[model samples]
Target: EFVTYSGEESPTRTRILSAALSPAERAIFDVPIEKWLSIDRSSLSGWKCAVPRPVTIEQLRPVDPSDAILRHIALYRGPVTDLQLDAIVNAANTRCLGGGGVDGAIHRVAGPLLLRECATFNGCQTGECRLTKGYQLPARYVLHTVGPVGERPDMLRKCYRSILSLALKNGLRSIGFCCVSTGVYGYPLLPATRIALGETRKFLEEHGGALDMCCFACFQEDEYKTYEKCVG
Candidate 1:
């Protein structure tokens, strides 16, 4: 049950039910004995949430309104599948080998032919990108980019830029990016997202609508939320 206390000062005749007298109790509370008022603020100094470290992407305001290029970007929450696009980026490891997350999923869907082609690339370097035929998959091509096992800024952005450049060179107008390096690869979801969005924005800005659309393929709910706010 809720509780309230009776005290001196406002001593009229009413035996008011303390549980119902929140305003009276609020008015009677004394100074915090544990210095509780300031502890929350001070404790945050040591907290991870308090700092942006790699990317304080949470604080990035919604994207520019009336952005002409905005029309070209879209967010999808699910497995990356289907056609209707020139290519999709795979968050593959250095071997250009299929690893976990979407990388593996794409390989499984694309079938064994993709593996044969990936082998020909002689593996990719982190931050670098390579292209392969989609084979049985609906997409015409798959862009493979090696993602760092840990958080690395320039490399991650480079992955995005390189993928877009590959798309443009191939004369493809639309492409999708499976959330890069944020999974088993070791990039934090928020920071990776920030870098992905930033690089995609820059590429679109430079190319105009030449690369008409670039989409983010997120598999998790929380991850989708992160992309939603940034793209908003």
Candidate 2:
């Protein structure tokens, strides 16, 4: 029932629905294993929707006191998987295998090779990040970071910092980050946005032009507007 811009089934949606699910994914989505791979029409044809190309809310200059012109930062409203940047950040659980929302979407697009690569990491801690090849994704890599499940602002900030550091070490020049901890993890939107922008700006300031673009990829209009207001 879901569609992309061309009025066909969304590749992302179809890939997720048809792809095999991990035990964790089944549990996270609360679907019984017996019907895990099922995608019958009766259960989905009742609804359909589509979205256009990603929107760039505005490009803002660095807020650092330094005169250096660093990377461009902007709020983007779209599925991060569609971005063709060097990498896109995943709001992943510590397992880094997959869970729900952004994590699940990224895994579905990147294929099972991503899961195999992730398994070798054992696991990440809250606020830490891991890197993996993007596989089938448009972006070359996916930076999986675990955000806090509660009101720990410091940990959330660390998640951003860790991702930036990992990207720098890997020589990735651009990255798109989903708003970590703002969804099922329980961090509220305002403070999470504050931490995300603050950490990104601080990283760019310290590193100067280390990154070409540090895009904030939001899934909803409200999120895009929230980041836009914060950037302003």
Candidate 3:
């Protein structure tokens, strides 16, 4: 049995196969499992659909940015990993080996196969993005991007730019995102949300139907509300 994993440092990983790791031990790697069950397409039946509010490009800064392109953007309040889209963005640490928050949640739900693929990446740079298969996730692919800590708005902007550009290049039509660098990572919510909205709007405006859907996947009510006000 291969007991070695590239990012494995703790005795927990050494003693157990990654696939055989208990949820409790997975927590030791910062991949906490609050809900042990994995989600599927069936899980979406209970998910309520809210019409996405239009976020005008001029609202972000002040476009002939068509209504059709605007329609491509959406605000979704759900788990990013659960979205049945082409890809979901992971707010990963530069290590990209899976830390806490959304990164850990994505890794836990996607299963050990994701970890195996991620291990080969070695690491990612802050504001840079990398791609991997989604494994057990409902989505087909995962985009791993490292967000800047604290108040680096420029780096935060790069994170969005990098992911969106990669998504377009790879022909991923629908990609879901969780708030990057906000909350525990220390990016202020208001500016972070604006940056996300601004960059996404710019991308759709420039690329036009290259992407079909770009969903802002918000798990927290406050995040949803902030995005609502920004788009409004």
Candidate 4:
């Protein structure tokens, strides 16, 4: 068997996998659980997600990551909009029209009909997520979330919260997220992942059972690796 995954270490992950692991050790998983149920104590590291600050598992709702896939937060290397998951987020400019990278690809796949719906919203501000139907894509809804133009941790953090919150309120589960504002927007990899993951963690804590899984869709190997240390 092969285990493949990458992201920050999280206390939520610990509680999820704790039952599967023997009680003899308190460990932090360094490698991700692609085959989630099969993970051992071999890859464990704490303090990966709480960098530059203090955090605790008390912040997240206590649910097995497998049961509430949002707790474990899946990490994948691919085009986010192509995933057949429940819903996929769109990284767009204020116009929600489209731009380079994920924005362009998602727009291309969803078709002009999608553009037509978004056009009705007029525009979304930074850190806001406006929902629309996915006409040609597999998903039922495409959340058009606008990420900041540059490195703005606070704004980016809001981006994660707003998008996930919208999905929760709408009763959708399982989706993939492209690296928001981390592309040509110029956010440093580590901090961006940390903020995004942290916000997601807090979101789950506050609103339990809303999302089943949130995949951090990374495009490059190195980009994926940057998150591995932070997610368990």
Error of 4 at 76 (Å): 1.4
What ranges in model 1 sit over 4 Å off?
1-66
TM-score of each: 0.70, 0.71, 0.73, 0.68
Higher-lDDT candidate of 2 and 4 = 2
TM-score: which candidate is best? 3
Question: Which candidate, 2 or 3, has the higher TM-score?
Answer: 3
Measured with C-alpha atoms, the lDDT of residue 124 in candidate 4 is 78
Question: C-alpha displacement of 223 in model 4, angstroms?
Answer: 1.7
State which candidate, 1 or 2, has the greater lDDT. 2
By TM-score, is 3 or 4 better?
A: 3
Per-residue lDDT for 196-225 in model 1, tens only? 989988888888858766767677898989
Best by lDDT: 3
Model 3 TM = 0.73
Steric clash pairs (candidate 2): none
Which of candidates 1 and 4 is the stronger one according to TM-score?
Answer: 1
Between 2 and 4, whose TM-score is larger?
A: 2
Per-model tally of clashing residue pairs: 0, 0, 0, 16
RMSD of each: 25.1, 12.5, 9.7, 18.5
Mind sharing the TM-score for model 4? 0.68
Q: How close is candidate 2 to the true structure, as a TM-score?
A: 0.71
